[PDB]
A = this chain, B = another copy of it.
Amino acid sequence: DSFDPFASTRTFNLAMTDIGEMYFMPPLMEALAQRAPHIQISTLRPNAGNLKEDMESGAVDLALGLLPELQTGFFQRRLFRTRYVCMFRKDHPSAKSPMSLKQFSELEHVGVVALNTGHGEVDGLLERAGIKRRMRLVVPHFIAIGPILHSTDLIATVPQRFAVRCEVPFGLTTSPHPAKLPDIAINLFWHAKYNRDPGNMWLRQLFVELFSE
């Protein structure tokens, strides 16, 4: 086909995690305002069936995150790797940075289940490393984290990006995590069929320009 961002009115469909939405969308829409102001963007969670078939059909253009299932017929590219960080409200009575493992186990925690994303492991990685945490609140997803941490003496274990997005708006501070946790690798997946498609290419290159390290 052909592609002119100035004029293009095409709809792009992006699969991403909720945090992925929170992190990618604002600087992307900000960029798209000056680069392709007439195209449309719609996001969806990866779980919603069926990612392989939909990406193969063209219903979904790109996908971002761990998404380990996509292998054959899929090009991928790593935008960045992110570390886990301990985050809490700045005026916290006792929390300190860098935080000791002892204090970590002593304090009370909010847990994000984060089922079927790479961030679901943490609550188990800590358990298998023999680190007791007082789980005062357990929520499925990350949306309520900032608000909760701001109004309580709770602490949370979140990826560094979620921390940076929330630090200023909710008066939160962070701390290098007291527990040896792995990094998460964040990739950009696109189907091999559309590897040469000008539009898909352009949007890809934009994602790389914006987010890659």
Asked if residues A43 and B139 are in contact (CB atoms below 8 Å), the reply is: yes
Q: Is the interface of A mostly helix, strand, loop or mixed?
A: mixed
Residues of B close to A141: CB separation below 8 A: 18, 21, 143
Within 8 A of B (CB), among A57-79: none
Nearest Cβ in chain B — how far from A108, in angstroms? 9
Is the C-beta of A146 less than 8 angstroms from some C-beta in chain B?
yes
Report A150-173 CB contacts with B as 1/0, cut-off 8 Å. Answer: 111110000000000100011000
Asked if residues A148 and B44 are in contact (CB atoms below 8 Å), the reply is: no
Interface size, A (range): 35 or more
Residue with the greatest number of chain B CB neighbours at <10 A, chosen from A18, A30, A139: A139
Asked if residues A151 and B48 are in contact (CB atoms below 8 Å), the reply is: no
Give me the interface of A with B, judged by CB distance under 8 Å: 18-19, 21-22, 25-27, 29-30, 33, 40-45, 48, 135-144, 146-148, 150-154, 165, 169-170
Bound together, the chains give a CA A159 to CA B30 distance in angstroms of 24
Q: What would 28 A/B residue contacts be, using CB atoms closer than 8 Å?
A: A19-B143, A21-B139, A21-B143, A21-B144, A22-B147, A25-B144, A25-B147, A25-B148, A26-B144, A26-B148, A26-B150, A26-B151, A29-B136, A29-B137, A29-B148, A29-B151, A33-B153, A40-B135, A40-B136, A40-B137, A41-B137, A42-B138, A42-B139, A43-B140, A45-B140, A141-B143, A147-B165, A169-B169
Asked if residues B27 and A140 are in contact (CB atoms below 8 Å), the reply is: no
Bound together, the chains give a CA A18 to CA B165 distance in angstroms of 18
Asked if residues B138 and A41 are in contact (CB atoms below 8 Å), the reply is: yes
Residues of B close to A138: CB separation below 8 A: 40-43
Closest 10 CB pairs of A and B: A169-B169, A26-B151, A42-B138, A21-B144, A143-B143, A26-B147, A22-B144, A29-B152, A30-B151, A41-B137
